[PDB]
Every structure is written in C-alpha cells, then in structure tokens.
Amino acid sequence: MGHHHHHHSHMNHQHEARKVRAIYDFEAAEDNELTFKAGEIITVLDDSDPNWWKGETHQGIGLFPSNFVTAD
C-alpha cells in the first residue's frame, strides 16, 4: 500500500494574506520562482520559512527566496 494523500485538518486561524514591497528586481529563473521588478507590491500568501516565501504578482505567482524585499 501507499500512493498519495493530501488532507489538511480544520485549522481555524486568522489566515491573513500579507504584502511585501520589492526593492530589487528579478525575473523567475525557475517555474517555481516569482517574476517581478523593483518597487512592486507582492502579496505573499504563505511564508512557512524565512528562506522560501510564496507570493503573487500580475507577472506570475511563485517563490522569491532571495528576500530582496520589505514588508508593507
């Protein structure tokens, strides 16, 4: 037995999507990476670790581990 399972428990918390502003520019090198320039407002939907953040831009949705950004 054993194939694939993905089931989250009902984690009733204040799931707040937070925003971060870019100070430096970088286009997505990988498909998992995020494409955006300097000054942009990236909505980070899930930051589990300060090493890998998942955010949203109108250029694409992905990760920006370089952390060349600020929080506002």
Reported as half-sphere exposure (CB side, CA atoms, 13 A), residue 39 has a value of 0
Count the helices and strands in the chain (H runs, E runs): 0, 5
Number of domain units in the chain: 1
Judged by DSSP in three states, 30 sits in coil
Q: In terms of C-beta density within 10 A (0-12 exposed, 13-18 middle, 19 or more buried), how is residue 64 classed?
A: buried
PDB experimental method = NMR
CATH no. for residue 14?
Answer: 2.30.30.40
Q: Are 69 and 20 in contact (CB under 8 A)?
A: yes
For the record, the structure tokens of 3 come out as 């194939």
Q: How far from each other are the two terminal CA atoms of the chain, in whole angstroms?
A: 47
For the record, the structure tokens of 8 come out as 């989250």
Amino acid identity of 69? V
- Domain residues for 25? 1-72
Q: Which of 36, 34, 29, 37 is nearest to 45 (CA)?
A: 34
